[PDB]
Design an enzyme around this catalytic site. Structure first.
Site, mmCIF file in Angstrom:
data_model
loop_
_atom_site.group_PDB
_atom_site.id
_atom_site.type_symbol
_atom_site.label_atom_id
_atom_site.label_comp_id
_atom_site.label_asym_id
_atom_site.label_seq_id
_atom_site.Cartn_x
_atom_site.Cartn_y
_atom_site.Cartn_z
ATOM 1 N N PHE C 358 35.575 10.578 66.868
ATOM 2 C CA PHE C 358 36.766 10.186 67.605
ATOM 3 C C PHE C 358 36.947 8.667 67.608
ATOM 4 O O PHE C 358 38.005 8.165 67.230
ATOM 5 C CB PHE C 358 36.666 10.728 69.031
ATOM 6 C CG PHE C 358 37.664 10.142 69.987
ATOM 7 C CD1 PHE C 358 39.029 10.229 69.734
ATOM 8 C CD2 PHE C 358 37.235 9.560 71.175
ATOM 9 C CE1 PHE C 358 39.948 9.748 70.655
ATOM 10 C CE2 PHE C 358 38.148 9.076 72.101
ATOM 11 C CZ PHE C 358 39.506 9.171 71.840
ATOM 12 N N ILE C 363 42.673 5.135 68.200
ATOM 13 C CA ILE C 363 43.189 3.850 68.667
ATOM 14 C C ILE C 363 42.333 3.237 69.773
ATOM 15 O O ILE C 363 42.478 2.058 70.090
ATOM 16 C CB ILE C 363 44.640 3.980 69.205
ATOM 17 C CG1 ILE C 363 44.671 4.901 70.429
ATOM 18 C CG2 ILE C 363 45.560 4.512 68.120
ATOM 19 C CD1 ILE C 363 46.003 4.941 71.140
ATOM 20 N N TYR C 364 41.424 4.029 70.340
ATOM 21 C CA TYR C 364 40.861 3.716 71.650
ATOM 22 C C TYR C 364 39.695 2.739 71.652
ATOM 23 O O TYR C 364 39.402 2.125 72.676
ATOM 24 C CB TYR C 364 40.456 5.002 72.365
ATOM 25 C CG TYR C 364 41.611 5.942 72.605
ATOM 26 C CD1 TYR C 364 41.811 7.048 71.785
ATOM 27 C CD2 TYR C 364 42.528 5.708 73.632
ATOM 28 C CE1 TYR C 364 42.890 7.901 71.978
ATOM 29 C CE2 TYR C 364 43.619 6.556 73.832
ATOM 30 C CZ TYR C 364 43.790 7.652 72.999
ATOM 31 O OH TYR C 364 44.856 8.505 73.180
ATOM 32 N N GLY C 365 39.044 2.580 70.505
ATOM 33 C CA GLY C 365 37.900 1.690 70.431
ATOM 34 C C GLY C 365 37.043 1.979 69.220
ATOM 35 O O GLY C 365 37.526 2.528 68.228
ATOM 36 N N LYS D 269 40.890 -5.133 69.552
ATOM 37 C CA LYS D 269 40.055 -5.160 70.742
ATOM 38 C C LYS D 269 38.945 -6.196 70.684
ATOM 39 O O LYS D 269 38.372 -6.537 71.721
ATOM 40 C CB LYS D 269 39.439 -3.782 70.993
ATOM 41 C CG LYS D 269 40.429 -2.746 71.484
ATOM 42 C CD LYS D 269 39.736 -1.450 71.855
ATOM 43 C CE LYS D 269 39.107 -1.536 73.234
ATOM 44 N NZ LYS D 269 38.174 -0.400 73.458
#
Ligand code: F43
Ligand SMILES: C[C@@H](OP(=O)(O)O)[C@H](NC(=O)CCCCCCS)C(=O)O
Ligand SMILES: O=S(=O)(O)CCS
Ligand SMILES: O=S(=O)(O)CCS
Lengths: 247, 568, 432, 568, 96
Positions: C358, C363-365, D269
């Site tokens: 995942f 996009i999350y990390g 990030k």
């Protein structure tokens, strides 16, 4: 010499799951190389595969035993981009279910990166390698093209009520029933195609129910496949026990 | 149970078989597998129309592009039907967008009420006055101290000349109350300051609380929401300590700044402080009183349903709702990510009575098979075992899956596999907790549900939904250092749990369920349970799900607004 | 008494009848030597310091202090600088301090004497003394005015102590800073996969070997190898990490030409049955055989080997690092469905792989496989059995990544890859 | 200098010699050493009367004690005169209470505008699309991406069906602009998205900026204030990255979730992220983008006075004002403590033109003794030395001290020694920075001022004012690991500076002064300088002091209010 | 070296130097000490697996939800490494 058994269970669903995992899938329809390339949408039909790095034979490789003993795929050798094919599959007895598409890919194809989600299943691989896997998924019983759809984005549909013509909802309307056959006239990210692709006549609800790898209470109930429920119970028990003490 | 099943079906009828806005869903059978999709776009929804209009006007006004549904790939939202959500246990029918935390003042205020709150012991402070200054602490001096404190705490002066102060109109939500396991002292406290344990709790629950904390006295401090919003969670204990220190200086005529004051400081900031949650490690660096530090037991105790209900399932379900909102919508959906976020990942667990239906079915199953084990009691519980977990969790999950299959409306409702996984596993976990009085038996039931779910449908949740669920069963009863923990003490920083939606609210409900089934006063911390047993707080922690509905219909009044100092 | 034969990366016998207990980080001299060298060593970018001094670009992304330029020929004086740095870093004359000029004077390897580690609570003395030595050396060599001292200092140290690390400085090690630890005993787990692959010179099995040594040294420091769990972790280290009995090498070899994740499962189950580690417990009506593990820790080690073997086969075929996340997931998932036995780490490799997939596709990390490590929130969960595969996967990548080994770990590979025990860890642990 | 001295004296007249509210201060010579104290109490001040009434009514309404000036020890506030403050450089006369950050929307919005902001490079993301997908990135695809991004960033959907979204009316302050050192690309960016470096800066300053960043492109992201207030600073970079990721997926027709997307994530990030500030250690645990992590150079660059003024003293003084407000009132006065807090510790540096007077006296002294060294230029500066620091800082401090002694009104104004110390040392430090172009020579001057101050008056500041000042002189030019650092890179987490009021704003001004005296475009980071060169932000960073006054007179409109969803 | 102190109310647990030599820092003394006590109690008193979490947390407290063993029963002279303000500060984190 070990003969793989793949999966427990003694229902049609379990039998279909073993068919998908072992790659023993009936070919039901044909798709041309150019039409496959068209629906995937990564390059113009018939064009050369773009590269992300030079061919292995050109730049050379580190000499270690793994690179020597493990043969690079044709796509790796060529330095292809890693591209994808992604499916959404209806929970109303689509032949395929996400995890079992991923098992199909992992067991039967080299150099693949399968991902399983509830509403989408994806195989990423070197583009030409991916196309080989894509072709089998497009042509064989693992896909019904009414109950499933090739969708690289905006995948919503697997859990939505079916349309009255038996086709799974697509927000972006990439494929539909036309004159008793499934026509796809956009690629998997919904960019309109020059030429529509005939994906063949859909399975009847009856045939889909026979070919499906999904359990449902109104077809083949999960509760009724005792072997698979027992398998879950054994995996659960063992994981729990060995987490306390591995003995 | 029959009543909840009827409620679930009514929700499906309201959602899918009668029109919402202009979505033309004017009829239909809720068991029908097929539907017509009208491709109306966002204009079918009156809230969406309002948003489109605002987006256009603001873009024009400010001179840079803004909200515009036509920027969506391929087509705008709502090519199938945009349909409402009913808050579970209520008849509050919500615009979907009105349940996004950004659009919901009730949701924001629930977090602010937790973030701006800490608990500080009085006994150490009083011992300091006695030992170092020779002061006599009485009910009279305490009551005077508390009035001084409730002047000082919002940000007002008690010692120095020429001080500026916070405007009372901006900080009216700030106050301090006290509670004490010493009944003799409680009788002497000015009632305006008192959280009365004997009044607020049943006799059995009050006894558990008072036996737990002994004859100790505590301050429930709630600092201004406007300050909490300007700053952060780690502000709270510092703010409380500063004004506690000033109030002790003033009320007991100390030197305004002597060595003994430093002991009061350390007592207030460290030695006798109880935070809502502790700090988080570098990658998700945050100080105390942020959602990630909030243990599942602590949330279960902030939620007040255990105090006002005798229904152990209802108590657990309210905690699930509060947790899914906070942990997924605000914490994981904002703090740890952001954007559109995770509204419906959470709403699946507190709307349309689908989780409630599965849970109440389980209660009836457990009561029938296990001599009423799911009814409130400490000695009617089943001994936690792999056998009992397998029985209850498998039955729970099979029923829930069959309900999704017999009602295609429920499946379309919870369209994401993660949503269904959260619902099925929460019901199974809550059930196992109710029957056993063992929260980690509840965790085992949660994970077994996931495993059965996966094999049933050939799918589970999103890409990385079951990182913790595949690590799950094996880490339930592990006693390895960074693996072992009772669920009551687990939280969003328990390593497996640190990332993913669809879980943390469920684990909070599982912790609560183990104790609500027993009729316990609290899940892990009596101090928090009593602290939030207070109707003066703007958020009604006894009815968190309903409060979210009140926010959706724009009838919730939050604290911390600045209209006083804003121009016309 | 569990013994193994240790084979190297090319499947050649190194040492026979090695007690797995002798492979423990707490007993093995070679492993302790690798740990000591990892702790006591840093790289200093001399070209970076020189550029920072001249431009004022020091202290972090985007930073530049205008009007304070110092034009010092750092690289041209690299030998003299190395010599003076050694004098400052060393504790006694003729001790084990080692300061070496790297890449034609563009960087230094600074290895503090082990006495600084012995007298320290952790490993940061290598960084602080290394940075101090370089700072003092430049101050003296180039005759810096006191009012320019802050500029020379931050050219080396970056934004420290305003930041907790030497952000925008020119000193790096294999490890991070202790405050970045998620858990207790996690320091040796906070090693970027790209670092290990760089050090291994993109040798897949030596990368997984070195990673295994670090990971299990972490599990040991975590107190996750106490009592029965010591045998448990050491079987994993021996078989998955150190190619015990040539099992890893042989399974990869027999699946190398045409093999998949699926065929590796056949190899693993066949060999486990042949070895008597598992046997049929019950046969169901369909003919499906539910197996039982006769030695649970040994079965876990079989699954650990299979997980890495599948990575070498699947990432090897694709010459693509990204395949590792799905490989770890599906090898173990499919293994469980084949056997009725739990996968490696009783679900925790599969679980780690679910989130790892995942967070390497969303996009999350996360990011590409190379950014992950045993202290990473995404990939910490398995007890050392996942990250070694990630390091091997990164080593096998032919050029698909944005954040490649060179991108993140160029200095580390150049400065640390020449250390024999690091580049050939299986041979080191075997005693050659 | 004469004009500023006249402003100073005018401010003393307004504050002390003509009555404010009903304080009956109707006459007097501002050089008079004596006064009459009327013991009127808080009622002499109309804001205090308003606050008293509010506190009384709210206490009655809510049923627990609240604001009540009679709870003050001995007597209520204002036994001497309560007198106003004039924002330095302006004629804005303020109620003292109106300068508390809680009561001032301008102050809160300044922090929100910094907290909700981060900068993310575009080049690595574009390189990712090129390498992994073979995408061609053009000005056309970038402009499309930017319009998608400005729909997505406020919290709206671009890929999935059935998404809920943030209400545009609640998030209208959220947007993304771009800037680039590539002039050719800048010419092709849709102007609605562009921060034009060549337009916004002088040619010299634009050249410095473009030389610094090269031909690189950057996103200036400002996430919703309502989100920033609900969450924290560490939210910002995550929020930005999520919607950057979604917009790249949508605008470039990627797979909505493939391996290449993870590279965009890591870029956004981590690898191409520039935060306002970094995380803080455990005792003051906080993630990125909190005031403690904000380096003095970064604040100097956020403040936009350098871009719009050619007066190096004015530029430094605005940074001092912004810094004293943020670092002392909000950061040290709330985040790190709380309560009444530190309003006047900060106002001493940005009101009544006392600091300005001392600073402009210094400018004239320097120009007359050092051939105009305090006028803008890079080659007219004095070499940093103990000699020059001793000369300038001693003259500065003696003048400032003598001004406090010649005007008893000024001394009573800055009634706390810490206030006087901040003013004297800020003037001396800014002066030394202006003269030398060396920020640490400025620090040396700051500390010498403190030492002279101490011996002059036999007192300095509060109990722990000069922890850093006694460590100060010796740590200015230290190169020891946790001692050495250029002032530009120092900040609130520099060990000596981590605790105490009356310093951090001064150090920010000292950092700025070294560079404003040279005419430099920026103090430490061009990316922040350009990011905030943008009038769309609600806070005017070009004139922070005046903005605090706009807030005091209730004419500042903040972002993030929830009026839309609150009942009437 | 493991010594009973205070008539059995507490233990001194000194790990062998080898655990420090093989470790990056000092936390192995705490984790191994706590693991040893946890395992010993589990065995000695025949704890049922579903009660293992209770035995574990009696020793380890709220770890790993908290970064430390908050509300546990294991302490040393030092803190945990993550509490360091600076680099090289571990031996400075010892309260007077
Ligand atoms: C782009 C990604 C890749 C990624 O890392 N995250 C996404 C997108 C992201 C975006 C989508 C917003 C938008 O449309 O612009 C947000 C809202 C996070 C954000 N940035 O604010 C989200 N996901 Ni997703 N995402 C969700 C879901 C899901 C489910 C949807 C399945 C279906 O059949 O519709 C699938 C995963 C799965 O199959 O299990 C999913 C995938 C994805 N998720 C795939 C896009 C799939 C597609 O092409 O349609 N989400 C859900 O299952 C429910 C919750 C829901 C979230 C919004 C909310 O909670 O209200 C949203 C949460
Ligand atoms: C993994 C880690 O990200 P990094 O790899 O450090 O960039 C982490 N994110 C998250 O865990 C985000 C979780 C919430 C969004 C996904 C929910 S399923 C964080 O930002 O600290
Ligand atoms: O599609 S992914 O599972 O990566 C994200 C779900 S929101
Ligand atoms: O009096 S003290 O110096 O301790 C506090 C100053 S606000």
């Amino acid at each position: 010499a070990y003969e793989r058994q793949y999966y427990p269970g003694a229902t049609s669903v379990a039998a279909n799951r073993r068919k998908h995992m072992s790659g023993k899938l009936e070919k039901l329809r044909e798709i041309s190389d150019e039409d496959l390339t068209a629906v995937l949408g990564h390059r113009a039909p018939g064009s050369d595969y773009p590269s992300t790095h030079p061919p292995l034979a050109e730049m050379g490789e580190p000499a270690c035993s793994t690179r020597e003993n493990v043969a690079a795929t044709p796509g790796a050798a060529a330095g292809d981009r890693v591209r994808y094919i992604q499916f959404a599959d209806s929970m109303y007895n689509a032949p395929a279910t996400p995890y079992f598409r991923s098992y199909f890919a992992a067991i039967n194809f080299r150099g693949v990166d399968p991902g399983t989600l509830s509403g989408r299943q994806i195989v990423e691989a070197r583009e030409r390698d991916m196309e080989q896997c894509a072709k089998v998924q497009m042509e064989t019983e693992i896909t019904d093209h009414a109950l499933a759809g090739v969708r690289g984005a905006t995948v919503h549909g697997h859990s939505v009520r079916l349309q009255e013509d038996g086709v799974m909802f697509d927000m972006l309307d990439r494929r539909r029933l036309e004159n008793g056959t499934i026509i796809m006239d956009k690629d998997q990210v919904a960019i309109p195609l020059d030429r529509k692709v005939d994906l063949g006549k859909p399975m009847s609800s009856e045939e889909a129910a026979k070919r499906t790898t999904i359990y449902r209470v109104d077809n083949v109930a999960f509760r009724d496949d005792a072997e698979v429920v027992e398998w879950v119970h054994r995996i659960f028990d063992q994981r729990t026990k060995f987490g306390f003490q591995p003995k | 149970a029959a009543d909840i099943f009827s409620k679930f079906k009514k929700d499906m009828e309201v959602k899918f078989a009668q029109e919402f806005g202009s979505n033309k869903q004017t009829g239909g059978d809720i068991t029908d597998k097929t539907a017509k999709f009208l491709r109306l776009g966002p204009e079918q929804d009156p809230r969406k129309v309002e948003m489109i209009k605002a987006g256009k006007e603001i873009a024009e006004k400010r001179g840079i592009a803004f909200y515009n549904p036509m920027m969506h790939s391929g087509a705008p939202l709502g090519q199938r039907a945009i349909t409402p959500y009913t808050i579970s246990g209520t008849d509050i029918v919500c615009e979907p967008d009105d349940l996004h935390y950004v659009n919901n003042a009730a949701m924001q205020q629930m977090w602010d009420d937790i973030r701006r709150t800490c608990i500080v012991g009085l006994d150490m402070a009083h011992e300091t006055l006695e030992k170092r200054l020779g002061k006599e602490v009485t009910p009279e001096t305490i009551n005077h101290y508390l009035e001084v404190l409730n002047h000082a705490m919002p940000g007002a002066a008690v010692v120095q000349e020429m001080m500026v102060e916070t405007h009372p109109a901006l900080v009216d939500d700030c106050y301090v109350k006290v509670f004490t396991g010493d009944d003799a002292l409680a009788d002497e406290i000015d009632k305006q300051f008192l959280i009365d344990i004997n009044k607020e709790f049943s006799e059995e629950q009050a006894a558990q609380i008072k036996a737990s904390i002994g004859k100790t006295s505590w301050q429930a401090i709630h600092i201004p929401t406007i300050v909490s919003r300007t700053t952060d969670g780690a502000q709270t204990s510092r703010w409380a300590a500063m004004q506690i220190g000033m109030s002790f200086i003033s009320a007991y005529a100390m030197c305004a700044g002597e060595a003994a004051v430093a002991d009061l400081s350390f007592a207030a900031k460290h030695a006798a402080l109880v935070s809502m949650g502790e700090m988080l490690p570098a990658r998700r660096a945050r100080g105390p009183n942020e959602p990630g530090g909030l243990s599942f037991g602590h949330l279960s105790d902030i939620v007040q349903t255990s105090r006002v209900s005798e229904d152990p399932a209802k108590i657990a379900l309210e905690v699930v709702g509060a947790g899914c909102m906070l942990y997924d919508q605000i914490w994981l959906g904002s703090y740890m990510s952001g954007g559109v976020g995770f509204t419906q990942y959470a709403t699946a667990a507190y709307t349309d009575d689908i989780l409630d239906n599965n849970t109440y079915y389980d209660v009836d199953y457990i009561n029938d098979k296990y001599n009423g084990a799911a009814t409130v009691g400490k000695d009617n519980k089943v001994k936690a075992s792999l056998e009992v977990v397998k029985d209850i969790a498998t039955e729970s999950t099979l029923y829930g899956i069959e309900t999704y299959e017999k009602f295609p409306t429920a499946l379309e409702d919870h369209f994401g596999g993660s949503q269904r996984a959260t619902v099925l596993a929460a019901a199974a976990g809550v059930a196992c907790s109710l029957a056993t009085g063992n929260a980690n038996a509840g965790l085992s039931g949660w994970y077994l549900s996931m495993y059965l779910h996966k094999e049933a449908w050939g799918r589970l949740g999103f890409f990385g939904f079951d990182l913790q669920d595949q690590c799950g069963a094996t880490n339930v009863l592990s006693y390895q250092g960074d693996e072992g923990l009772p669920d009551e003490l687990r939280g969003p920083n328990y390593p497996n749990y640190a990332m993913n939606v669809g879980h943390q609210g469920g684990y909070a409900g599982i912790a609560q369920a183990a104790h609500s089934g027993r009729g316990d006063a609290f899940t892990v911390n009596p101090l928090l349970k009593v602290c939030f047993a207070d109707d003066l707080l703007p958020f009604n922690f006894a009815e968190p799900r309903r409060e979210f509905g009140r926010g959706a219909i724009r009838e919730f009044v939050p604290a911390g607004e600045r209209s006083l100092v804003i121009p016309a | 008494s569990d013994t193994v034969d240790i084979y190297d990366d090319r499947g050649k016998l190194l040492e026979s009848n090695v007690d797995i207990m002798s492979l423990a980080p707490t007993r093995n001299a070679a492993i302790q030597s690798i740990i000591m060298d990892t702790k006591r060593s840093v790289a200093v970018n001399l070209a970076g310091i020189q550029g920072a001094l001249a431009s004022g670009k020091m202290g972090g992304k985007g930073r530049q202090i205008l009007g304070r330029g110092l034009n010092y020929d750092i690289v041209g004086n690299a030998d003299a600088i190395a010599e003076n740095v050694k004098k400052l870093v060393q504790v006694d004359e003729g001790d084990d301090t080692n300061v070496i000029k790297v890449k034609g004077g563009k960087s230094l390897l600074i290895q503090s004497p082990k006495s600084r580690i012995i007298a320290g609570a952790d490993f940061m003395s290598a960084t602080t003394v290394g940075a101090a030595a370089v700072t003092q050396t430049i101050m003296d060599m180039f005759g810096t005015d006191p009012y320019d001292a802050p500029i020379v200092k931050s050219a080396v140290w970056g934004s420290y102590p305003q930041t907790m690390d030497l952000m925008g400085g020119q000193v790096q090690g294999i490890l991070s800073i202790p405050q970045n630890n998620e858990g207790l005993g996690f320091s040796l787990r906070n090693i970027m996969a790209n670092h290990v692959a760089a050090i291994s010179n993109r040798n897949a099995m030596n990368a997984s070997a070195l990673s295994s040594i670090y990971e299990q040294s972490g599990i040991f420091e975590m107190g996750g190898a106490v009592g029965m769990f010591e045998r448990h972790q050491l079987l994993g280290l021996a078989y998955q990490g150190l190619n015990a009995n040539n099992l890893l090498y042989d399974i990869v070899k027999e699946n190398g030409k045409d093999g998949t994740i699926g065929t590796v499962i056949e190899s693993v189950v066949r060999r486990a049955i042949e070895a008597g580690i598992i046997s049929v417990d019950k046969t169901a009506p369909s003919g499906y055989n539910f197996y039982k593990a006769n030695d649970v820790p040994k079965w876990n080690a079989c699954a650990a080997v299979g997980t890495l073997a599948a990575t070498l086969v699947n990432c090897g075929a694709g010459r693509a690092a990204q395949n590792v996340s799905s490989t770890l997931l599906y090898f173990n998932d499919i293994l469980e469905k084949e056997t009725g036995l739990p996968g490696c780490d009783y679900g925790k490799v599969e679980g780690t792989a679910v989130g790892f997939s995942f967070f390497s596709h969303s996009i999350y990390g996360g990011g590409g496989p190379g950014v992950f490590n045993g202290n990473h929130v995404v990939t910490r969960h398995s007890r050392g059995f996942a990250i070694p595969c990630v390091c091997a996967a990164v080593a096998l990548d032919a050029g698909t990544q944005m954040f490649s080994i060179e991108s993140t770990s160029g200095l580390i590979g150049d400065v640390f890859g020449a250390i024999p025990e690091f580049r050939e860890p299986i041979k080191a642990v075997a005693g050659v």
